[PDB]
A = this chain, B = another copy of it.
């Protein structure tokens, strides 16, 4: 008939799956006959148009990971689906071989964990000569799984290796030993806070600061958000700052201040920005159906807000609009001047972020 395509629902932005498990992607669109469907992987065609609204993978492997989206069409026009990221849980082997490292006695030893390919990042247990190494006042283990001995002693010498476990599929692999040799002061920050981005509602995000001082027992780490002292979410010998349920208000400059108690010496601070992200949301949208006369000018509205502020891209029947008779306003609205009857079809406005994308559509009829 004459019902333009439209989506009944949108897919989740991200989805994690096990290797060997089945994946079923759906294009939940409605519209007039014949409603046909085309699938894309990383914006590259997987299928040709058909009445099949599903894309099914019987047994997932790593090569299947990526962004999927469908294109729905009929006689009226075509729409680009909001894309979903399919992530496949896997774990490779430990690549590196045995290695050697040397540190001076009483100084900090920084031993980075051997690289292993894995999604998600694996949980890592450190071993010294077959014995587990839990965190302590002089032993720090970073979010990057880096081992940091704050003040080395002779019996620190030995063979260090990691056990890495993938929490999603339960894969468990052990690396080759790293031999540490121990060879015969104001507060310093060894592992500074890194810039961290997170989407609102992620439930947890952690900043980290590993500090060192002589004497070590007098070392005290103070956490601040935009200069304001923090007193919650702090753990792991004051090296981790964790924000539960982060919101855009939880964004800002988080600094780690390393100081010595009962000491005159000045503290040292290192800081990083926490970016809490909100996916795009439309403020103004075009009407479902727009009618306009030939050779005339039509203004099609599209405003969106998000954190960071969303960029706006227009599509005509699942294809990119070149902005010519087409102009895009600063607000993001589309202006089509000198309307031709062949400008008839589905126009789509995509508001995209680092946190995700949103879409709104309309059917333009040129009389």
A residues near B (Cβ < 8 Å) are 3, 8-9, 11, 13, 18, 20-22, 24, 26, 28, 30-32, 53-54, 56, 123, 125, 132, 134, 165, 167-170, 199-203, 232-233, 235, 244-245, 247, 278-285, 288, 306, 356, 358
Q: How far is the CA of A202 from the CA of B283 in the complex (A)?
A: 18
Q: How far is the CA of A20 from the CA of B200 in the complex (A)?
A: 32
This chain's copy number in the assembly: 2
A279 and B26 in contact (CB under 8 A), knowing A170-B53, A170-B54, A202-B201?
no
Chain B positions within 8 Å of A285 at CB level: 232, 235
Chain B positions within 8 Å of A123 at CB level: 8-9, 28
- Cβ contact within 8 Å between A281 and B244: yes
Q: How far is the CA of A8 from the CA of B235 in the complex (A)?
A: 12
- Cβ contact within 8 Å between B358 and A244: yes
Chain B positions within 8 Å of A245 at CB level: 200-201, 278-279, 281, 306
Q: List 29 A-B contacts (CB under 8 A).
A: A3-B132, A8-B125, A9-B123, A11-B167, A13-B203, A18-B24, A24-B168, A24-B169, A24-B170, A26-B167, A28-B165, A30-B132, A30-B134, A32-B132, A54-B170, A200-B201, A200-B245, A203-B279, A203-B356, A232-B281, A232-B282, A232-B283, A232-B285, A233-B282, A235-B285, A244-B279, A244-B280, A245-B279, A247-B247
Chain B positions within 8 Å of A247 at CB level: 200, 247
Chain B positions within 8 Å of A244 at CB level: 279-282, 358
- Cβ contact within 8 Å between B232 and A26: no
Closest 7 CB pairs of A and B: A201-B201, A244-B281, A54-B170, A21-B21, A8-B123, A24-B170, A200-B201
The minimal Cβ–Cβ distance linking A30 to chain B, given in whole angstroms, is 6
Chain B positions within 8 Å of A201 at CB level: 199-203, 245
- Cβ contact within 8 Å between A28 and B199: no
Q: How far is the CA of A13 from the CA of B244 in the complex (A)?
A: 13
Known: A20-B22, A28-B167, A232-B285. 11 other contacts (CB 8 A): A8-B125, A11-B167, A18-B21, A21-B21, A24-B168, A24-B169, A26-B168, A53-B165, A232-B283, A235-B285, A244-B279
Chain B positions within 8 Å of A165 at CB level: 26, 28, 53
Q: How far is the CA of A123 from the CA of B11 in the complex (A)?
A: 12
- Cβ contact within 8 Å between B24 and A22: no
Chain B positions within 8 Å of A30 at CB level: 125, 132, 134
Q: How far is the CA of A165 from the CA of B3 in the complex (A)?
A: 20
The minimal Cβ–Cβ distance linking A228 to chain B, given in whole angstroms, is 15
Q: How far is the CA of A203 from the CA of B28 in the complex (A)?
A: 18
Chain B positions within 8 Å of A356 at CB level: 203
Q: How far is the CA of A165 from the CA of B37 in the complex (A)?
A: 16
